Amino acid sequence: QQCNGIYIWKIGNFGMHLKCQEEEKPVVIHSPGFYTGKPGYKLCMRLHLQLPTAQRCANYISLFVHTMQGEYDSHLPWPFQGTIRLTILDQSEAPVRQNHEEIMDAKPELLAFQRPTIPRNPKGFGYVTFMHLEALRQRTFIKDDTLLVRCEVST
């Protein structure tokens, strides 16, 4: 059997988030906290739609990962080590599917990978420029006004 922890984050009412971003208002949403297994780490994803006017990163989807205090923390090694695959799923025809993803190795020297002293680690690890919003107009990433984000963790 396989052993990686995988979470599928469904972000509904996406059109509403886009309108908000275009109105130059912050758009920050988090996935529910999820476990990489049992025992496993409790993590959550953070998605930001950068403002149309953000200079370093205008009109980008930012995607980060945060460690959280989990119920199995006493039975896990720390700091966290492993790889995390972040993917925005193509929901078009299966004939040929091109997901948009990045794979990142954890860096144990960063406090983002230690256990937080509060529910959610203030420090997160990820990509400010994960995917440009214009990319959503090139493939059916949005279906039934929903975006699908996948997170696979390999410890």
Binding site: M104, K107, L111, K123
Partner: peptide, 9 residues
Amino acid sequence: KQEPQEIDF
């Protein structure tokens, strides 16, 4: 290759 980074929110 795009490289991830740590951000303190």
